[PDB]
Amino acid sequence: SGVEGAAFQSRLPHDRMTSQEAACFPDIISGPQQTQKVFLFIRNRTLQLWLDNPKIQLTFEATLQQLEAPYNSDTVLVHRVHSYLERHGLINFGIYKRIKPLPTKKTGKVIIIGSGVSGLAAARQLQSFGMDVTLLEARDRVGGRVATFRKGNYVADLGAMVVTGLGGNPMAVVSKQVNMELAKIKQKCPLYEANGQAVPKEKDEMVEQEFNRLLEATSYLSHQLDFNVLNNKPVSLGQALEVVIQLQEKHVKDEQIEHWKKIVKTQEELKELLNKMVNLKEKIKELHQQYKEADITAEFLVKSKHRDLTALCKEYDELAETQGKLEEKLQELEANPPSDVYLSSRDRQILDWHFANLEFANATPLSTLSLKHWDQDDDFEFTGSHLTVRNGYSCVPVALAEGLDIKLNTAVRQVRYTASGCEVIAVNTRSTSQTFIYKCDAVLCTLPLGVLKQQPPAVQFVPPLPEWKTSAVQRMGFGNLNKVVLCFDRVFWDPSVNLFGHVGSTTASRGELFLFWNLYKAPILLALVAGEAAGIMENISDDVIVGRCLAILKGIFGSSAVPQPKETVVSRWRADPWARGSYSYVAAGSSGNDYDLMAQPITPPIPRLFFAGEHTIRNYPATVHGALLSGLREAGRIADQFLGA
Numbered sequence: 294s295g296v297e298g299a300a301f302q303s304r305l306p307h308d309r310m311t312s313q314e315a316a317c318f319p320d321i322i323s324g325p326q327q328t329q330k331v332f333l334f335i336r337n338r339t340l341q342l343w344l345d346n347p348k349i350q351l352t353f354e355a356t357l358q359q360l361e362a363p364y365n366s367d368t369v370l371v372h373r374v375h376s377y378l379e380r381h382g383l384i385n386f387g388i389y390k391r392i393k394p395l396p397t398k399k400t401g402k403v404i405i406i407g408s409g410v411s412g413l414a415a416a417r418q419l420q421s422f423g424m425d426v427t428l429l430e431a432r433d434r435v436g437g438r439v440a441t442f443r444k445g446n447y448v449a450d451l452g453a454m455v456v457t458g459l460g461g462n463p464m465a466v467v468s469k470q471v472n473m474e475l476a477k478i479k480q481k482c483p484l485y486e487a488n489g490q491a492v493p494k495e496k497d498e499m500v501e502q503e504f505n506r507l508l509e510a511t512s513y514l515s516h517q518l519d520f521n522v523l524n525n526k527p528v529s530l531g532q533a534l535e536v537v538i539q540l541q542e543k544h545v546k547d548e549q550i551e552h553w554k555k556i557v558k559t560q561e562e563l564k565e566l567l568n569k570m571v572n573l574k575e576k577i578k579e580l581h582q583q584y585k586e587a588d589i590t591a592e593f594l595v596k597s598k599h600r601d602l603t604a605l606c607k608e609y610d611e612l613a614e615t616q617g618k619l620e621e622k623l624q625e626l627e628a629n630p631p632s633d634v635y636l637s638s639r640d641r642q643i644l645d646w647h648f649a650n651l652e653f654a655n656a657t658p659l660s661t662l663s664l665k666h667w668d669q670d671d672d673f674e675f676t677g678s679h680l681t682v683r684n685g686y687s688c689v690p691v692a693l694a695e696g697l698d699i700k701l702n703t704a705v706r707q708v709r710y711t712a713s714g715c716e717v718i719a720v721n722t723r724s725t726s727q728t729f730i731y732k733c734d735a736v737l738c739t740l741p742l743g744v745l746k747q748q749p750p751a752v753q754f755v756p757p758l759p760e761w762k763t764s765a766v767q768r769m770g771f772g773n774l775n776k777v778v779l780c781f782d783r784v785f786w787d788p789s790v791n792l793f794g795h796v797g798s799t800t801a802s803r804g805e806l807f808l809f810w811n812l813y814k815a816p817i818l819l820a821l822v823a824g825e826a827a828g829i830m831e832n833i834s835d836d837v838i839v840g841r842c843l844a845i846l847k848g849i850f851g852s853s854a855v856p857q858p859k860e861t862v863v864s865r866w867r868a869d870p871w872a873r874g875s876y877s878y879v880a881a882g883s884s885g886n887d888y889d890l891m892a893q894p895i896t897p898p899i900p901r902l903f904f905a906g907e908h909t910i911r912n913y914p915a916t917v918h919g920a921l922l923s924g925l926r927e928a929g930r931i932a933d934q935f936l937g938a
C-alpha cells in the first residue's frame with residue numbers, strides 16, 4: 294500500500310509506534326487508542342509526501358495543505374509530528390531545494406572531522422537546523438571510503454560501489470536527489486580453475502551446496518549448541534569451519550572403513566566356503582572311486598551308493614549356489630566404494646573460493662570473525678536487487694558537499710574537549726608546518742575505526758578517551774579489501790556476465806584476485822583482493838600485480854586475446870593513513886553491543902564529543918547507508934542538546 298509503503302521505506306512499522314516515538318510522544322501512548330491511530334496516519338502520510346518528491350524541502354505548511362480532512366484539522370499534532378520527523382532526519386535529509394532559505398544567524402559551532410558520507414550527512418542536517426558547520430578533511434577530496442577514479446572514458450569506484458536493496462534504504466532517496474545511474478547486477482558467476490579451465494556445472498553446484506551446508510552447521514553449533522567459548526577463548530568462524538570440515542572427513546573415513554570391513558568379511562566367507570567345497574570334492578572323489586569298485590548285496594550296494602553319491606552332489610550344488618550369491622555380493626561391493634575423500638584437491642580449491650568470497654564480504658579472514666555474532670545484522674537487510682553506480686559513487690558525496698564549509702588537506706592531529714567547549718588542531722597536508730586551531734561548541738568525529746586504532750595515534754584526544762570507549766575500539770574488527778582496475782581498448786570477456794571467478798590454488802592465498810567484475814559501459818575489469826591476501830598484497834608494485842591479473846585472464850580467454858591495458862589503478866586501503874583498512878567487522882569476542890558503545894558521546898555537565906561513521910551503527914555497519922543513517926542520528930542528537938528536544 295501507499296502510506297504503509299512510506300513507513301516501510303522509512304524502516305518503521307506502519308501500524309505501531311516505536312519506542313523512540315513513545316519517548317517523544319508520551320501523551321499519545323497513554324491516551325486513547327484512537328488518537329494513536331491518528332498519530333500514525335499523520336506520520337505515514339508525511340513520510341509519503343516527502344518520499345514521493347524528495348527533491349524539495351517538505352514544510353509543515355505543505356504537509357498541512359496536503360492532508361485530507363479530518364487530519365488537516367489537528368494542526369498542533371501535525372506540527373508535533375512534522376517537527377519530530379524533521380529533527381530525526383526522516384524527512385528533509387540529503388540534498389533538496391530549500392523553501393525556507395537558510396537562517397542568517399547560526400546557533401552553535403560544530404566541527405565535523407571528516408568529509409565522508411557520515412560527516413557530509415551530519416553537516417547538511419546541522420546546516421539545515423541553522424548551525425555553523427565546518428568540515429576538516431585530511432584528503433584533497435570528499436567521499437572518504439567512497440572514492441571514484443576517472444580518466445579518459447574510464448570511471449571506476451575504488452571504495453564503496455554497491456547500493457543494496459532500495460526497499461527501506463535511505464540511499465533510495467539520495468539516488469533520486471542526485472541522479473545516480475544505478476544498474477542491477479546479473480547474478481551468474483562462472484568459476485575458472487587456476488589453469489583457466491571452466492568449473493563444470495556439476496562441480497560448481499556440488500561445491501556451492503556443500504558450502505551452504507557447512508555454514509548452516511556452524512550456525513547450529515553456535516546458536517543451538519552454544520559452542521562459543523573454548524579453552525577460555527571465543528570461537529571464530531574460521532575455527533568452527535575447520536571443525537565441521539574435520540567431522541565430514543572423519544565421516545568419509547568411517548564409511549570407507551565400514552566398507553572395507555564388509556569386503557574383508559565377504560572375502561573371508563569365500564575363503565572358508567572354498568576350503569569346504571575343496572573337502573567335499575575330496576569326499577566325492579573318494580565315493581566316486583568306491584562307486585566304481587562296484588549279487589543281491591551288490592544290487593543293493595549300487596542302490597545305496599547311488600543314494601550316497603547323489604546326496605553329496607546335492608550338498609555340493611547347494612554350496613556352489615551360496616558361492617554364487619556371495620561372489621556376486623563381493624562383485625557389487627567392489628564396484629560401489631563410498632567417496633575416497635571428502636573434498637578432492639580441486640574440490641577443496643573451489644571451496645576455498647567460496648570462503649574467499651565470504652572474506653571479501655566481511656573484509657577480514659574468517660579466523661577473525663565472531664562465530665556467534667558475525668552476522669547479527671542480517672535481520673535488517675533491505676529488499677530488492679542490488680545495483681551498481683554506473684556514473685561513479687562519487688556523485689553522491691560531491692552533491693552532498695554543495696554549500697558546505699569544507700577545508701580539505703586539513704589533517705586533524707589533536708582533539709581537546711572540556712565542559713566549556715572544544716578545540717581541534719590540524720595541519721596542511723601540503724605544508725605540515727602550517728597549523729590551524731578551530732574552537733567550537735561540539736565536535737563530531739567521523740574518523741574511521743582504523744584511524745582510531747592507529748598506534749601510535751594519528752589523532753590525540755585531550756583528555757584521553759574513557760576505558761569503556763577505548764577497549765571497545767580495541768575489540769572491534771577493522772578489515773581490508775582491495776581492487777585492481779584494468780582499462781582496455783577492447784572487450785574480450787563475456788559482456789553478459791557481471792562476475793567471474795578465479796579459483797586460487799591454495800587456502801592461504803585463496804583471496805588473491807579471486808573475483809572479477811564487469812559492471813560498466815566501458816571495458817573495465819575490477820579484480821578483488823580479499824582476506825589474508827589483502828594486506829599482504831599492498832606490498833606489491835602496481836605493474837607486477839597487474840601482470841598477475843593479465844596472466845589469469847590470458848589463461849581463461851587465451852594469451853593473444855588479452856591486449857595490454859590502457860590504464861590501471863590499485864587500491865591499498867590498509868596503507869592509506871586516512872583509512873588504515875576498509876570497514877569494521879564483528880571480531881571474535883566483540884558484538885553488536887560494541888557498535889552501540891561506539892555511538893555513545895562522552896561527557897567530561899553536557900556531552901561534547903560525538904561519534905558517527907559506519908562503525909557506530911549496530912544494525913547497518915560497514916555500509917554507506919549505515920554511515921548516512923549514523924550522520925542523521927548524530928545530527929538529531931546534537932540538535933536536541935543545543936536547540937532543545
Ligand SMILES: [C]C1=C([C])[C]=C2C(=[C]1)N([C][C]([O])[C]([O])[C]([O])[C]OP([O])(=O)OP([O])(=O)O[C][C]1O[C](N3[C]=NC4=C3N=[C]N=C4[N])[C]([O])[C]1[O])C1=NC(=O)[N]C(=O)C1=N2[C]([C][C]=O)C1=C(O[C]C2=C(F)N=[C][C]=[C]2)C(F)=[C]C(F)=[C]1
Pocket residue numbers: 406407408409410411412429430431432435436437438439451452453454455456457653654655656703704705706739740741744751752774775776810819866870871872874875876905906907908914915916917918919920
Ligand atoms: C573501503 C571499502 C571498499 C573497498 C568497498 C566497500 C566499502 C568500503 N563499503 C563501506 C563504506 O564505504 C563505509 O561504510 C562508508 O564509507 C563509511 O563512511 P564514513 O563513516 O563517513 O567514513 P569515511 O568515508 O572514511 O569518512 C571519514 C573521513 O575522515 C577522513 N580523515 C581521516 N583521517 C583524518 C581525516 N580527516 C581529517 N583529519 C584526519 N586525521 C577520511 O579521509 C574520510 O574522508 C561499502 N559500503 C556500501 O554501502 N557499499 C559498497 O559497495 C561498499 N563496499 C563493499 C565492501 C564489501 O564487500 C560492499 C559491497 O561490495 C561491493 C563491490 C565492490 F566494493 N567492489 C567490487 C564489486 C562489488 C557490497 F556489495 C555491499 C556492501 F555492503 C559493501
